[PDB]
Amino acid sequence: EDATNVVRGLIVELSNLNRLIMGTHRDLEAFKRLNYRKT
Amino acid sequence: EDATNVVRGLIVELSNLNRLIMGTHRDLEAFKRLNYRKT
């Protein structure tokens, strides 16, 4: 009946994905920035 | 107390994102495929 452990598992999974999304976002902003410097 | 409408909202949001993820995946596999043909 208490599904806390399942929901907390989903929070951990989604928060890990969100951390990865923001790191990818910052890496893409950085990559675009470096190409303007190269070109 | 009944949080069905909230959870179903999350299912709709995540399933929309999953549809977008698989479409992006197929578009990336297609893009890589076309570059082998061009080169």
């Binding site: 009946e1 208490d2 806390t4 929070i11 989604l14 969100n18 | -």
Partner: peptide
């Protein structure tokens, strides 16, 4: 069949879902 969930945890899960919804599309669409 119903299960019990902490309101604060469902609010947190909602926050995580809304964050992927807000930032993932711009990356995937270029």
């Amino acid at each position: 069949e119903f299960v019990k969930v902490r309101k604060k945890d469902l609010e947190r899960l909602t926050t995580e879902v809304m964050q992927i919804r807000d930032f993932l599309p711009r990356i995937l669409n270029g």
